[PDB]
Amino acid sequence: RPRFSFSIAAREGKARTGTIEMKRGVIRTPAFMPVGTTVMALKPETVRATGADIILGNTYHLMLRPGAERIAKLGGLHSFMGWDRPILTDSGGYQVMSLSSLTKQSEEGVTFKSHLDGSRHMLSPERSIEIQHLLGSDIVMAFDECTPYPATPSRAASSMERSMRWAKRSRDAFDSRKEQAENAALFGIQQGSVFENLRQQSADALAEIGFDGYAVGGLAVGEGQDEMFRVLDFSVPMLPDDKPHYLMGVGKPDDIVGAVERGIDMFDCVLPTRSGRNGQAFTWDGPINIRNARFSEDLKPLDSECHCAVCQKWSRAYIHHLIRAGEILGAMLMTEHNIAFYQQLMQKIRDSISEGRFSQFAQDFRARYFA
Amino acid sequence: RPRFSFSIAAREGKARTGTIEMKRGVIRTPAFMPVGTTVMALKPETVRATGADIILGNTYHLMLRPGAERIAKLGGLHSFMGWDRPILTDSGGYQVMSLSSLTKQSEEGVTFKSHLDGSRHMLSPERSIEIQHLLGSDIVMAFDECTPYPATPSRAASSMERSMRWAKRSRDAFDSRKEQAENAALFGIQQGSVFENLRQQSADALAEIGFDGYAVGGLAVGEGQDEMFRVLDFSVPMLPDDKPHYLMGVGKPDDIVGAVERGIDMFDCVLPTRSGRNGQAFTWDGPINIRNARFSEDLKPLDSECHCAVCQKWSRAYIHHLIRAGEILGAMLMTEHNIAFYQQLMQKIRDSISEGRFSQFAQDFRARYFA
Numbered sequence: 088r089p090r091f092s093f094s095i096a097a098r099e100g101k102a103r104t105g106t107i108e109m110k111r112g113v114i115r116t117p118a119f120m121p122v123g124t125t126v127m128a129l130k131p132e133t134v135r136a137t138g139a140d141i142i143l144g145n146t147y148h149l150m151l152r153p154g155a156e157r158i159a160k161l162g163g164l165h166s167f168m169g170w171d172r173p174i175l176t177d178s179g180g181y182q183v184m185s186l187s188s189l190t191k192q193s194e195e196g197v198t199f200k201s202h203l204d205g206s207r208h209m210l211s212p213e214r215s216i217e218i219q220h221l222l223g224s225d226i227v228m229a230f231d232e233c234t235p236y237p238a239t240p241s242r243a244a245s246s247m248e249r250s251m252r253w254a255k256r257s258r259d260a261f262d263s264r265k266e267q268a269e270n271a272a273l274f275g276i277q278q279g280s281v282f283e284n285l286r287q288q289s290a291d292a293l294a295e296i297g298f299d300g301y302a303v304g305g306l307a308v309g310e311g312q313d314e315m316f317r318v319l320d321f322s323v324p325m326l327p328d329d330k331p332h333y334l335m336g337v338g339k340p341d342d343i344v345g346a347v348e349r350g351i352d353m354f355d356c357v358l359p360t361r362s363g364r365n366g367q368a369f370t371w372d373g374p375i376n377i378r379n380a381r382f383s384e385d386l387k388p389l390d391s392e393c394h395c396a397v398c399q400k401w402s403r404a405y406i407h408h409l410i411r412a413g414e415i416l417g418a419m420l421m422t423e424h425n426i427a428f429y430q431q432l433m434q435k436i437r438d439s440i441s442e443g444r445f446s447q448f449a450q451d452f453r454a455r456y457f458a
Numbered sequence: 459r460p461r462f463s464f465s466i467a468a469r470e471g472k473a474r475t476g477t478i479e480m481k482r483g484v485i486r487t488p489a490f491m492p493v494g495t496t497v498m499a500l501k502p503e504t505v506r507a508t509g510a511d512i513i514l515g516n517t518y519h520l521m522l523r524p525g526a527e528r529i530a531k532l533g534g535l536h537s538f539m540g541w542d543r544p545i546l547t548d549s550g551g552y553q554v555m556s557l558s559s560l561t562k563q564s565e566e567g568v569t570f571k572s573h574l575d576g577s578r579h580m581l582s583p584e585r586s587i588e589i590q591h592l593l594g595s596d597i598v599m600a601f602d603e604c605t606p607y608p609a610t611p612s613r614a615a616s617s618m619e620r621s622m623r624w625a626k627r628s629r630d631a632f633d634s635r636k637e638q639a640e641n642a643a644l645f646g647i648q649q650g651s652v653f654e655n656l657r658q659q660s661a662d663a664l665a666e667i668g669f670d671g672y673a674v675g676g677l678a679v680g681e682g683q684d685e686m687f688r689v690l691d692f693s694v695p696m697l698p699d700d701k702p703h704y705l706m707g708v709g710k711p712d713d714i715v716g717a718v719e720r721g722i723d724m725f726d727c728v729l730p731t732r733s734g735r736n737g738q739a740f741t742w743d744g745p746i747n748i749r750n751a752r753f754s755e756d757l758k759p760l761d762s763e764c765h766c767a768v769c770q771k772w773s774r775a776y777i778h779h780l781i782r783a784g785e786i787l788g789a790m791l792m793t794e795h796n797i798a799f800y801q802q803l804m805q806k807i808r809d810s811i812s813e814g815r816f817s818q819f820a821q822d823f824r825a826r827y828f829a
């Protein structure tokens with residue numbers, strides 16, 4: 088297989104379906120990427136069985152424990168966790184802004200204190216790319232600077248401009264490392280907040296540098312779905328049409344459908360795993376919270392049509408009891424179902440685009456999900 | 459299959475190996491019974507894959523949540539949790555003494571306040587048998603009275619005597635319920651503390667009543683292994699030779715080996731699951747605690763010979779990281795390995811008895827496990 092090849096097999100409006108071919112496997116798009124490392128209450132084989140083609144690893148959490156150098160010594164992230172398919176690593180950026188303390192930012196990078204033990208750390212475009220190399224990441228994210236939501240025009244421009252300088256530094260760091268350049272892919276991140284001109288400048292800068300894929304950054308950070316959709320409306324067409332478009336950190340099933348309608352090819356979110364442990368189960372008739380007393384004697388599966396192993400085997404009543412009791416098995420079952428549900432959604436999206444009936448699917452989905 | 463048939467295929471000294479045939483399956487003896495309901499961080503299929511033929515359910519915890527009547531309405535414990543092989547249920551006794559509060563004891567039974575929410579509950583020989591029926595238990599334990607360790611001769615005698623009266627009441631309650639009498643088995647529990655005459659009186663009383671199997675009760679409650687072994691030395695031969703002998707709540711691998719040398723056929727313990735989550739992994743060279751820093755870059759499996767899926771797939775280093783980080787997957791992997799290890803131990807015990815080399819195995823095991 089090649090290092091990287093994105094092929095678009097079918098289109099409907101702005102929506103696309105196709106494949107990304109990489110050395111460790113093929114990724115079907117539009118793709119949902121479960122967050123592999125909290126860590127999912129799932130073995131890699133189970134994650135694969137749900138239909139996932141690729142998982143995400145968070146660089147911020149991994150650099151804190153067990154450490155990037157340690158993972159490299161142990162043979163890389165794939166070998167360490169037992170997942171042999173592609174892995175995309177985030178750059179560590181948003182989590183440094185959101186989780187760390189004593190964070191000191193500059194043009195060179197960011198210094199910060201761990202939220203776990205107050206130990207000191209550094210992250211720069213170069214060090215982020217290096218860490219992703221040590222992990223053995225297949226899709227490497229450029230290191231960017233986030234700005235807190237909401238953002239003023241000036242702050243949005245400054246952070247976007249810094250991010251583009253950092254995108255160039257990320258590109259150069261990646262290219263300088265032979266083994267990484269030849270075997271992995273590098274994605275750039277568009278910034279510019281809600282401002283169309285800044286998004287255009289960011290898109291132009293990233294295209295001039297050249298990347299294997301393009302993320303729409305700065306979303307799912309406090310804005311509502313309407314605003315997010317509006318930003319996507321003008322932002323996605325600015326990106327190179329022939330490369331994947333990745334919406335980081337999104338999201339709910341309806342966010343995903345709407346984003347695909349607007350040209351997004353890749354998604355990641357902790358929601359199905361995070362809210363899984365919290366009791367929230369996704370269904371075609373909308374989310375339910377399994378902790379609700381109404382499920383205590385409900386013998387139906389979490390969802391009536393879901394093809395996952397959990398819905399084949401266990402009742403709402405049993406899962407209700409497990410989650411109420413704080414049992415590990417409850418988290419295991421909820422997480423498996425939610426990730427399986429997300430993959431089934433992605434499959435339905437792929438199939439409908441391939442058949443030219445995605446707009447119809449999106450309407451039917453919304454009508455039922457919100458009924 | 460019959461309701462209950464225990465057949466002894468081979469013997470060596472006091473040790474026996476054979477089978478218990480029941481409606482829901484065959485149990486190989488000597489048997490280790492994982493505690494199925496905390497709840498194991500394992501799907502039933504995984505528990506079965508480790509080699510378990512039967513699991514234990516705790517009546518005390520189940521009566522508190524989700525409730526015995528509720529489980530019955532939902533189709534019984536097997537259907538509820540998705541395990542279709544035999545289940546043995548404890549009576550709820552020791553846990554009432556150990557976990558509950560406001561416990562008021564009498565000849566009729568015990569009243570107590572839940573340790574979860576302070577709700578009031580009752581347990582008697584009759585109600586315990588009824589609860590086990592509602593759960594759909596295959597092996598039902600008589601309801602007994604425990605006495606705190608250590609026990610005076612008088613207290614040991616009084617509690618043993620009450621337990622025997624309660625054993626008769628348990629027998630009669632079981633027999634009166636047609637569906638239970640015809641489909642399940644009933645085990646009696648020998649009491650009498652460290653006192654040989656009381657153990658003999660208890661054995662005689664239980665044999666006169668008649669049960670399908672006989673537990674040695676009142677052990678693993680604070681006494682050391684030497685004392686436990688001494689009590690077993692004289693207690694086990696008092697029980698009917700042609701019925702299974704069950705040592706409740708035991709135990710460490712070396713406890714199990716020594717107990718089989720003394721005639722025990724069945725075991726249950728939370729240790730492999732409980733200490734699994736705590737970081738303790740069993741190996742043929744003795745237990746290790748995976749949280750220890752010496753394992754942080756150890757690429758070997760938990761045990762060098764173990765045939766379990768965890769030892770096929772993941773390193774000590776990865777599991778070390780998961781447990782240190784408090785990840786659910788760490789508990790999953792540790793629990794699977796520990797239960798698999800216990801089943802492998804039981805298999806080696808069964809095979810060596812069948813081949814007349816169990817005494818040799820026991821010696822070789824101890825030499826290595828304690829090396």
Ligand SMILES: [Zn+2]
Pocket residue numbers: 389390393394395396397398399424425427428
């Ligand atoms: Zn499902």
Ligand SMILES: [Zn+2]
Pocket residue numbers: 760761764765766767768769770795796798799
């Ligand atoms: Zn193992």
